[PDB]
Design a protein around this ligand. Structure first.
Ligand SMILES: OC[C@H]1O[C@@H](O)[C@H](O)[C@@H](O)[C@@H]1O
Ligand SMILES: [Cl-]
Ligand code: NA
Length: 358
């Protein structure tokens, strides 16, 4: 498309991740891995609004970006993830969140969106790019037999619609999460996915701020694999560019020339999983291609780092209410702390295994 949200902007670096990385780098005991680890804080990432408590930090990021832009004569761009649906993470245990459908979840969620909108409205010289609700829509394509997801469907659609509709009013550029090649990229899932994304786009009034879709968020797939990972057997769409190339024409037929962003923050090391569905703290992952608008594809606006590597995907402790057996598989790094908390050993391996190297 003509308007790539990133062109002409300088990305505001996540202060949240910067603080995690600075603390982590000081604990890496070779001075050269430590300098490479510290350099990660200069790589743009998405900051997750995974609880309502963080909304005031969004406010600080916007105001800090505005001042940095003025001090430098640049236009600044803040990257966020909207991730607080009620009955969040409906097909897994590790990332259940603060809101529940049974306890006013939708009303709570819409209040969370209102508070985000109210922050963004105050800083019109800062651009915002938001990834909308990782996993939610993909779960509504393949996981309607999961009763928690079935029972969540109407609420998820309402909440996502509220987010899209209201963030559009403050000019936020949005990419709705769309799973990954091993999830929605199976040829047989492409059309049900496109049909859902089309519905969602229509219900939010087709705002031009809804740019398209995000893929591979918090996953590990290649964008363009040298050879298919053996986990992909049976699926000709073995990497994200095959998935996107196959999905985008369906969206175009349905009236929407969508564009895409692709997470590569934990994609540096391929062929490290037993099964494709192994998503949790996959051992040996490395930082992948750095964010760039040099994407290799007409459909892809940017390679991005959405999941911030080093932040855990889920606990391996089976005494936790958030224990998911995926997080104690043989290819899952163990022991692992709660999802969203820092996992130092995992970060250092991401640094050592980075490809391209840091
Ligand atoms: O690290 C990014 C996000 O990862 C998710 O798996 C966690 O549930 C969130 O708490 C965190 O914000
Ligand atoms: Cl079930
Ligand atoms: Na997750």
């Amino acid at each position: 498309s003509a308007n790539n949200p990133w062109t002409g902007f300088q990305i505001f670096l996540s202060p949240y991740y910067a603080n995690e990385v600075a603390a982590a780098a000081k604990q890496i005991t070779d001075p050269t891995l430590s300098s490479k680890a510290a350099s990660v804080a200069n790589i743009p990432t998405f900051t997750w609004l995974d609880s309502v408590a963080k909304i005031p930090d969004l406010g600080t990021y916007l105001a800090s970006a505005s001042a940095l832009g003025k001090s430098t004569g640049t236009k600044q761009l803040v990257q966020i993830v909207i991730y607080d649906l009620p009955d969040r993470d409906c097909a897994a245990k590790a990332s259940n969140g603060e809101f529940s459908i049974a306890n006013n979840g939708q009303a709570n969620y819409e209040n969370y969106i209102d508070q985000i909108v109210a922050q963004i409205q105050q800083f019109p010289d800062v651009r915002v790019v938001a990834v909308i609700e990782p996993d939610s829509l993909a779960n509504l394509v393949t996981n309607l037999n999961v009763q928690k997801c079935a029972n969540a469907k109407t609420t998820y659609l309402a909440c996502v619609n509220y987010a899209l509709t209201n963030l559009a009013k403050v000019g936020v550029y949005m990419y709705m999460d769309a799973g990954h090649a091993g999830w929605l990229g199976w040829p047989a899932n492409l059309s049900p996915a496109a049909q859902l994304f089309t519905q969602v786009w229509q219900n939010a009034g087709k705002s031009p701020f809804i740019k398209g879709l995000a893929t591979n968020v918090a996953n590990y797939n290649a964008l363009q694999a040298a050879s298919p990972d053996p986990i992909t057997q049976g699926n000709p769409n073995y990497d994200e560019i095959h998935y996107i190339n196959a999905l985008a024409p369906l969206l175009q037929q349905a009236g929407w020339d969508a564009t895409f962003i692709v997470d590569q923050g934990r994609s540096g090391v391929q062929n490290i999983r037993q099964q494709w569905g192994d998503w949790c703290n996959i051992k040996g992952a490395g930082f992948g291609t750095r964010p760039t608008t040099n994407t290799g594809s007409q459909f892809i606006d940017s390679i991005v780092w959405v999941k911030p590597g080093g932040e855990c995907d889920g606990t391996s402790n089976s005494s936790s209410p958030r224990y998911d057996s995926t997080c104690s598989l043989p290819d899952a790094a163990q022991p692992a702390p709660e999802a969203g908390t820092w996992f130092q050993a995992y970060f250092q391996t991401l640094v050592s295994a980075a490809n391209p190297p840091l």
